Amino acid sequence: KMSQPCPCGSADEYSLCCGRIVSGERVAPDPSHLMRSRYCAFVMKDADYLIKSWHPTCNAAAFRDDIIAGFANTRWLGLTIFEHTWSEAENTGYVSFIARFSEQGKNGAIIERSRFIKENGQWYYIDGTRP
């Protein structure tokens, strides 16, 4: 009735899922959590988080405006993760996902395997490859 299920699809309340991470209250334990959290930020148009979650070498602040601009063109309709891998030895991780959306009234889906890198206890997004 008054539930606020997380936009990531976890069946958990946002406050207790991706929301505590985007709030800064909780560090993302793994690449999957970060991916989910970034998806929620896209859905909730945060951008500041999307920049904080972007690997520092990418200089995200510089393209903040383009992130905002992107918010207006797409409507997110769902996230489905089908693969996840990570290791402390590599400080690297991967998340394969399908993100469905709508653009100009036309539906579509993204299928990508994103890479995440860890720096000082925190995971950051960096790159991607179409699996």
């Binding site: 489905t80 089908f82 394969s96 399908i98 889906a109 299928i111």
Partner: peptide, 16 residues
Amino acid sequence: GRNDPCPCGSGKKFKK
């Protein structure tokens, strides 16, 4: 390719 089990779980194609 597209017809291999769509990881969406639809059971057949990414098209479908």
